[PDB]
């Protein structure tokens, strides 16, 4: 598990649950190509996302939709999405934790990042 | 003047109006003695606090009342407020914004400091 | 006017100054399209991007360059840079200030809108 | 395990190692009485600082000693601590995480309250 997605939820105090996150990994043509997408588990955590073989050094970009999960709690959001573009370094072992603390009209986004 | 506090709502995209803010200095029987307090305005913003001469050097705390502010918005908070601990004044005066930024179960909170 | 940028620095307690803002517009085709741009002041805020007249309804993505914001002061970062997107005027005219408070590895970004 | 403490490094990007965390809660007089304390762990969590018997109602603080892990880095911070102060509730079962996000001028908390 090199790249892991946790998004919070800053009006329940929660895990924020089923949220889309898409991500892409940018082409030698400068547009993003999708890489892998799935939706936050009841933990508020994307797990499985891609593999060690697959998580080359190259620029990433972590959509989470966050406008589609504030609809649906009827709270009105400024942001259409949260996104996380970022450099994957090969210094060493790594994995990659990208959290997102979500409101209405603010988010905060963290990376952690590990030796394994 | 050298200490202003503003503070952001993060549901509404907002100023945080009308919320109470309690600033406290520490003594030295280390007790904590009540310095200034006042409300925000319709910025956000709490001006004249104290003035340079009555700001010396100390521990101080800045307490922002959230609780009140999210139950007159009808939201369960989870804080009962935002304490924010810090020397000031060690190396001199300085002017200090201490800014707030709310949401029902998390805030931040930052300080610019300029000389 | 209608658009701001304020830019703030979580190590230093300081504006963030001289950090690139790169604003677009999403157009017909889809396409991102090359709406405004500057820099930030001493203030760690940008002025001056647009007019109430250009700054119609539409989607906006507004890029903060921290990567090199950073890299000059010579902490190593995470991120490329924070992209704030959004959908701005779709209920008649507003003013934006879009707040963004950095650290080397999170940054927050925040919403004021008035009307 | 009702209550848990998650401390992270903004300027590194890693869990906040061996911070000194101290819980207090409201006494009738008025006073904070020492309930619990230790020090982060490797993944900057900690652990086991009470039981479900004796969390009960109340009004509680997390003190999390950041100045003293901001001056060990060499980093001149602003804060003498982050203080968290919040009121226990046993609206059926629950689990506190107090989670806290670390800038030598700045810091973020969230409480994520969960249904275990
Ligand atoms: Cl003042
Ligand atoms: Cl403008
Ligand atoms: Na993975
Ligand atoms: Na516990």
């Known amino acids: 598990c090199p790249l892991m997605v946790k998004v919070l ?4 105090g929660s895990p924020a649950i089923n949220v889309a996150v898409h991500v892409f990994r ?7 190509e ?4 799935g939706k936050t588990s009841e933990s508020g955590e ?3 996302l891609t593999t ?7 620029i990433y970009k972590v959509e989470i939709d966050t406008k589609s999960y504030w609809k649906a709690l009827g709270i009105p959001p ?20 990208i959290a997102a ?8 986004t963290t990376a952690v990042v590990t030796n394994p």
């Open 34 to 37: 999708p890489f892998a997408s």
């Open 52 to 58: 060690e073989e697959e998580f080359v050094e190259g």
């Open 101 to 108: 603390l979500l409101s209405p009209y603010s988010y905060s």
């Open 9 to 12: 939820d800053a009006v329940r």
């Open 78 to 97: 400024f942001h259409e999405h949260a996104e996380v573009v970022f450099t994957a370094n090969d210094s060493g072992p790594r994995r990659y934790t």
């Open 26 to 32: 940018k082409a030698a043509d400068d547009t993003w």
């Open 46 to 48: 994307l797990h499985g």
